């Protein structure tokens, strides 16, 4: 079982993988922004609010995974928020609400995702390789198993198309 935000499976005992009691969402306490482990059942933000209906991500066309509410009446994947450079979290410990979506350039919405082939159905990011303009939705890149790594150089997030997967 694996955290659906960082795609890693941690046997960590303090920063554990929580399972939503209702939708079986799997996420690292620290990846989803959970202050502490509760005694009893844990519910993700989606299952706390409309447990029966699926929500849309404001930033992509995919429907599974870990969601938070935005500050403007919508929902968004934590991973989409993490990877689209203009998007923010108002609280960076609770990782919510997702905000600054209005700061995304319109250009991101005019790109075509090469994985799902859709244009205008989300905000695309692009291959980190210089002069590669191949674009993809964050969750499409994730689902397709593209290389996507987060590394702070003195946080730097780098995603690549399958041509430019790095050494
Ligand atoms: Ca709404
Ligand atoms: Zn994680
Ligand atoms: Zn849930
Ligand atoms: Zn999304
Ligand atoms: Zn896509
Ligand atoms: Zn590329």
Author numbering: 274 to 427, 438 to 450
Paper text:
The catalytic MOZ subunit is coupled to three non-catalytic adaptor proteins: BRPF1 (bromodomain plant homeodomain (PHD) finger 1), ING5 (inhibitor of growth 5) and hEAF6 (homolog of Esa1-associated factor 6). BRPF1 acts as a scaffolding subunit, linking MOZ, ING5 and hEAF6 together into the functional complex. This conserved arrangement of zinc-binding modules, named a PHD1-Zn-kn-PHD2 or PZP domain, is found in a set of eukaryotic proteins, including Jade1/2/3 (PHF15/16/17).
To define the spatial organization of PZP, we obtained a 2.05 Å-resolution crystal structure of the BRPF1 region, encompassing PHD1, Zn-kn and PHD2 (residues 267–454). Five zinc-binding clusters formed by the C4HC5HC5HC2H topological motif stabilize the overall fold. The Zn-kn acts as a platform orienting PHD1 and PHD2 in a way that the N- and C-termini of PZP are faced the same direction. The superimposition shows that the histone-binding site of the PHD1 finger is located on the side, which is opposite to the interface of PHD1 with Zn-kn-PHD2. The histone-binding site is not occluded in the BRPF1 PZP domain, pointing to a likely similar mechanism for recognition of histone H3 tail. One of the basic clusters contains a Zn-kn residue K383 and the K390 and R392 residues of PHD2, whereas the second cluster contains K422, R427 and R439 of PHD2. Our structural study demonstrates that many of these residues are found at the zinc-finger interfaces, suggesting that the structural stability of the PZP domain may be compromised in the cancer-relevant mutants.
